[PDB]
RNA sequence: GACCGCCUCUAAGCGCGCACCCCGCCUCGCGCCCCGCCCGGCCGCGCGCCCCAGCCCCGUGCCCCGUCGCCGAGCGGCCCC
RNA sequence: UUUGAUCCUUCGAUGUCGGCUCUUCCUACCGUCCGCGCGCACCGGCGCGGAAGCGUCGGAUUGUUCACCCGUUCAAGGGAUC
RNA sequence: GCGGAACGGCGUCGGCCGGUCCCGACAGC
């Protein structure tokens, strides 16, 4: 809006947040989460029920930052109520790719990637978890409460897997996310 | 215009200056870094060389022609008697570096050490520490250091020095060292451990064992003046030349108009 | 591999764009290039194991 | 810093033209000598009269009142350096004097374009129901309210005369 | 009197400035926790400008300057030094009257601070501008003792708020004597009639 | 967050200008940069300033929406607003100030003296009882 | 993940990353420090922290280095061997 | 980094080609490093961006710079009073 | 905030001329 701009989001019931100095704390069954916005000018308040983002004087590039930061919080919301899961495909053609989860789901070791001889170990950033699909044959599973670390790990799983020298258009091997939701 | 065929400068520019050392012997400037933890012990020794030698061993390492047959190897020797510890001195980490908390000197001192604060034993008259061993007589002192030192350091030393007599040396005053302690779980530990062994002799049967790898430090051979065929490698001229043939041709270009620290002189070798 | 299979991977390594500039990977229904600004776009040729 | 003023003029009566007809403009000037140069320059190109053929009858003064805020609308084309171009532009002011301020302040910072380089075609006020621009148009509102946009002037204002203080200050808001 | 000033949070060409300005005119000035100084512009851009800084040396003897100095304390001296007529004995004079300090160390902890608010960041830069330490600076081009600094500078900190509340109580006992006292009463009054 | 705005009514501070050291209210607002205000009670005419030069306050006064100057006076006159602010921390603040802004080069060495003994007393003050 | 209901590696935020760059190891090194013999002479008087889209009630204070201040203790610094 | 055009400084003189020797600098990058594209299955090639650390050689004929050929770990281009 | 051109920019601010729109436009009959 010309003199300020401003969006609001619902605060459900069964989540309980505080804010102070735009460090936001929510609370739900699943655990707690925090996140801090410090680095941008806003203007947050809590009114029955209700979170409302606001900045003065939109000039230029600040006219961006209210709706992302919304959706930033909204996303905590939806991990605390209930967490996100996003789960990963093994692709292989020829060599079948041998994956171990160790240290109590904290980490995984990807072992014969294109017949390789090294081996690769990616660990799980604090608070996300993995495991194979019990179900589904060559599944990975990772939860967690924040949408960042979780994707982040899958990320680093991806890039950890990858082939060099060659046709990408015709050798195609390695893990790629194939959902993300919630459960 | 560009120098028509390839090729690298003549020298190591890390080496700079090639001046005669300063020290008067070998330093060590660093010693290897502190692991909590480990069992502790002592990282350096002082010693003299003495001669060289052959050896006949057995190779075994895979993968290589030399796997499962003998080799004739070349071997140094070193002359090392006992070393005696006669002090502790303890540092603290600063915003400003290493700086030295205190060093506690033992109740007695031999006599190399004695020779090593003089320049002439004969004719000196002898007051080195004659104060300090009054009062040291008693525990007590070497107590209240030790307490200041457990409370104030994070790095210990201790100080030996040499006993040139069981050596065929004309020397008689001996060389001082510090040699730091690595180890322990705290500081009271090391400084405990130094403590027990103030007085004593030390045996570098007890600092290093076969197999290890060691560095060594010292000061190579001299030859005084020398000029940049020998000091520095560079190619001889050919034989046509007025003047002589052993220097470089060409020492710099028009400009910069100066002569620059990277071109090759004479001057002292070793 | 199963085609679903061959499908996933595809779309992670075969379908985008390139910029005849610079040669940078951009989406799919983007006008400009994000490194260089510009808008001659490509599409990433396909391979003949199609 | 301008002033408004009306003038009047008329070519040299001649033989053929006893009584020729009269001309009055508004003219927005910082003085009467700028009044009357501008006045004789719109006077050669729109009626083929110069100062050497015609004279002025009068270059008068008018003083405004200024107590209430009113939105004016001005017209104007002004010449660049790839040609010329009309302009419409919408000040909120309390006379018409000081929205020419405004107007030709805003001109110099945005389009790079000085008071010689500027023709005024008409300005006129404008009624809250009829505004173009979206600045005036939210402040002509009701029970409008925002935050000093600047408060560290004032805290930034008193430290250059006391240079060196015994704590930060803080910025009241 | 000397001038112990708090560095922390100021631009530092701005207070070299003020800094500079107040040694011509003959006092002593001292600067502390140097380390906090801020430069604006993004962290790559100072780097960048100070690795090219850094790039010029006399071609034919490198030990001939000039000189590049690697803490942020030199660093700050350096800046200031550039203000000044330092080739001449009026200004070699002043540059002797200067004390430039990473941290706080014991020859200045017991000092009373100042500051000069129009020279510090949170007044002078827009707020999204960007902006970096001179720490962080001098740590990327080869500053080693960082890590020390904190170090001392948490020690330090904690010892210092374990003195806050003895003056807290101290200077309440002395705020009911000099109310209770009745010279000083007679003070006030009159210094009252002026507004002081 | 925040607390005082540029408003209808708001008592403000002159801080620069011609009219430095004087309260005044806001009449109206002419955009981001510039309000009309004036003082018909503290001695400030009705004129625009820029809001660089005003320093909010946190007294409101409930003014009509267009008050001429006249009718504004007692609407003022009408209200405490003024009254509560001076005997403030800001107020008796600014009181001093304004007493201090009449000062020769004579009382200038007076005030000097009183205050020379003033540290003289603390120090004795302090010293003898901790 | 928005401006721009969708989509977007970017606008705020975050990850990975080069025989190049910087540091360590290695060569030189003014000046400093500890200890020994000695146990000396001089100079100075003054500490809350953190943030600026909570700024916790502000928009001060000092303003006399002699202008009458000068003991001791404490703390800090310098000089000599 | 060519060759011209001009005639500002130098005729009480700035020793005028090439090679040998030796140092440093540039990048508009030839191999090696990191990414992307292909009319990229693999091998091998070609294009683009960052990147100047290391490498860029031995010979026959010619005063030659240049050129030309043989060979090898297969062999970029230049500046600094040409 | 390099001397600098043809030619590019969905960087930001300000305009001119045309359409469609609560008789429901644009982006998701
Ligand atoms: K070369
Ligand atoms: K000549
Ligand atoms: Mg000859
Ligand atoms: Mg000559
Ligand atoms: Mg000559
Ligand atoms: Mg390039
Ligand atoms: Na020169
Ligand atoms: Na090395
Ligand atoms: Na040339
Ligand atoms: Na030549
Ligand atoms: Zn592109």
């Avoid at chain 2, 190591?12 to 480990?38: E, I, S």
């Avoid at chain 2, 045996?203 to 010292?218: E, H, L, M, R, Y």
């Avoid at chain 4, 002025?56 to 040609?83: A, M, P, T, W």
């Avoid at chain 5, 960082?146 to 509340?165: I, P």
Wanted: aromatic share 8%; net charge positive; hydrophobic share 35%.
């Amino acid at each position: 809006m010309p003199l300020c701009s401003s969006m609001t989001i619902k605060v459900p019931t069964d989540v309980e947040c505080t804010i102070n100095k735009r460090v936001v704390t929510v609370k739900g069954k699943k655990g707690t989460l925090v996140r801090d916005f410090s680095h941008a000018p806003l203007d947050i308040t809590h009114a029955n029920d209700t979170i409302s983002v606001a900045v003065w004087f939109p000039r230029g590039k600040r006219n961006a930052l209210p709706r992302t930061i919304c959706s930033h919080i909204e996303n905590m919301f939806k991990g605390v109520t209930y967490g996100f899961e996003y789960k990963m495909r093994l692709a292989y053609a020829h060599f079948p790719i041998a994956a171990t989860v160790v240290d109590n789901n904290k980490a995984i070791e990807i072992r014969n990637f294109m017949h390789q001889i090294k081996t690769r170990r990616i660990e799980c950033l604090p608070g996300v978890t993995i495991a194979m699909s019990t179900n589904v044959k060559d599944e990975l599973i990772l939860r967690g409460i924040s949408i960042e670390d979780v994707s982040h790990t899958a990320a680093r799983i991806h890039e950890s897997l990858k082939v060099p020298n060659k046709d990408l258009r015709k050798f195609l091997d390695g893990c790629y996310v194939s959902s993300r939701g919630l459960q | 215009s560009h120098r028509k065929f390839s090729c690298c400068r003549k020298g190591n520019l890390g080496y700079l200056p090639r001046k005669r050392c300063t020290r008067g012997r070998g330093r060590c400037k660093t010693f290897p870094p502190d692991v909590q933890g480990a069992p502790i012990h002592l990282t350096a020794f002082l010693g003299y060389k003495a001669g060289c030698t052959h050896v006949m061993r057995f190779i075994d390492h895979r993968g290589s022609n030399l796997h499962n047959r003998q080799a004739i190897d070349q071997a140094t020797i070193i002359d090392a008697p006992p070393m005696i510890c006669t002090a502790i001195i303890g540092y603290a980490k600063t915003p400003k570096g290493l700086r030295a908390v205190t060093t506690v000197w033992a109740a007695h001192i031999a006599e190399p050490a004695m020779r090593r604060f003089y320049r002439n034993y004969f004719h000196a008259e002898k007051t080195a520490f004659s104060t300090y061993m009054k009062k040291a007589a008693d525990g007590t002192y070497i107590k209240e250091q030790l307490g200041r030192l457990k409370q104030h350091a994070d790095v210990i030393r201790i100080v030996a020095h040499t006993q040139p007599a069981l050596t065929p040396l004309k020397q008689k005053k001996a060389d001082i060292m510090e040699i730091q302690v690595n180890g322990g779980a705290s500081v009271a530990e090391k400084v405990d451990y130094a403590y027990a062994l103030m007085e004593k002799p030390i045996s570098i049967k007890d600092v290093f064992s076969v197999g290890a790898q060691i560095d060594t430090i010292s000061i190579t051979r001299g030859r005084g003046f020398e000029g940049v065929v020998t000091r520095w490698g560079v190619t001889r001229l050919p034989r046509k030349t007025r003047r002589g043939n052993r220097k470089v041709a060409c020492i710099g270009a028009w400009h910069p108009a100066n002569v620059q620290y990277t071109v090759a002189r004479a001057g002292q070798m070793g | 591999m199963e085609p679903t299979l061959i499908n996933l991977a595809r779309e992670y390594n075969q379908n985008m764009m390139i910029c005849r500039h610079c040669y940078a990977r951009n989406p799919l229904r983007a006008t400009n290039c994000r490194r260089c600004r510009g808008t001659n776009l490509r599409k990433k040729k396909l391979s003949k194991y199609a | 810093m301008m002033q408004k003023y009306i003038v009047y003029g008329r070519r040299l009566p001649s033989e053929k033209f006893p009584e020729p007809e009269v001309f009055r403009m508004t003219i927005y000037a910082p003085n009467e000598i700028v009044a009357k140069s501008r006045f004789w320059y719109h006077l050669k190109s729109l009626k083929k009269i110069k100062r050497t053929h015609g004279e002025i009858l009068d270059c008068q003064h008018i003083e405004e009142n200024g107590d209430f805020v009113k939105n004016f609308g001005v017209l104007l084309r002004y010449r660049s350096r790839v040609g010329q171009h009309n302009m419409y532009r919408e000040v909120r002011e309390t006379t018409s004097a000081r929205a020419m301020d405004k107007v030709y302040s805003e001109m110099a910072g945005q389009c790079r374009a000085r008071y010689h380089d500027i023709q005024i075609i008409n300005v006129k006020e404008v009624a809250d129901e009829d505004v173009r621009r979206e600045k005036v148009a939210m402040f002509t509102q009701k029970g409008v309210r925002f935050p000093h946009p600047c408060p560290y002037v004032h805290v930034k204002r008193a430290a250059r005369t006391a240079r060196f203080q015994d704590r930060a200050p803080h910025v009241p808001q | 009197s000397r001038i112990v000033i708090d560095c922390k949070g100021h631009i530092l060409g701005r207070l070299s400035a003020i800094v500079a300005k107040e040694l011509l005119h003959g006092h002593e000035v001292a600067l502390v926790r140097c380390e906090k100084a801020i430069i604006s512009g993004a962290f790559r851009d100072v780097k960048a400008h100070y690795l090219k800084k850094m790039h010029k040396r006399t071609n034919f003897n490198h030990l001939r300057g000039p000189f590049h100095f690697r803490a942020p304390a030199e660093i700050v001296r350096r800046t200031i030094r550039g203000m000044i007529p330092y080739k001449t004995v009026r200004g070699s004079d002043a540059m002797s009257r200067l004390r430039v300090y990473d941290g706080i160390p014991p020859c200045c902890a017991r000092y009373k601070r100042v500051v000069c608010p129009s020279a510090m960041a949170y007044l002078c830069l827009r707020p999204e501008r960007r902006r970096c330490e001179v720490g962080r600076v001098a740590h990327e081009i080869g500053w080693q003792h960082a890590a020390d600094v904190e170090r001392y500078e948490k020690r330090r900190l904690e010892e210092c708020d374990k003195w806050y509340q003895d003056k807290i109580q101290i200077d309440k006992k002395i705020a009911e004597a000099a109310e209770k006292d009745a010279e000083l009463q007679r003070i006030n009054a009159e210094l009252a009639k002026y507004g002081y | 967050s925040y607390h005082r705005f540029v408003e209808a009514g708001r008592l403000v501070y002159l801080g620069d200008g011609p009219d430095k050291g004087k309260l005044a209210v806001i009449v109206d607002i002419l955009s981001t940069a510039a309000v009309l205000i004036d003082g018909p009670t503290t001695g400030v005419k009705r004129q625009v300033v820029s809001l660089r030069w005003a320093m909010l306050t946190d007294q409101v006064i409930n003014i009509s929406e267009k008050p001429t100057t006249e009718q504004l006076k007692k609407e003022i006159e009408a209200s405490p607003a003024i009254d509560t602010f001076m005997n403030s921390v800001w107020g008796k603040k600014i009181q001093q100030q304004r007493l201090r802004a009449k000062a020769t080069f004579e009382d200038m060495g007076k005030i000097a003296k009183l205050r020379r003994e003033r540290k003289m007393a603390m120090k004795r003050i302090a010293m003898s009882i901790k």
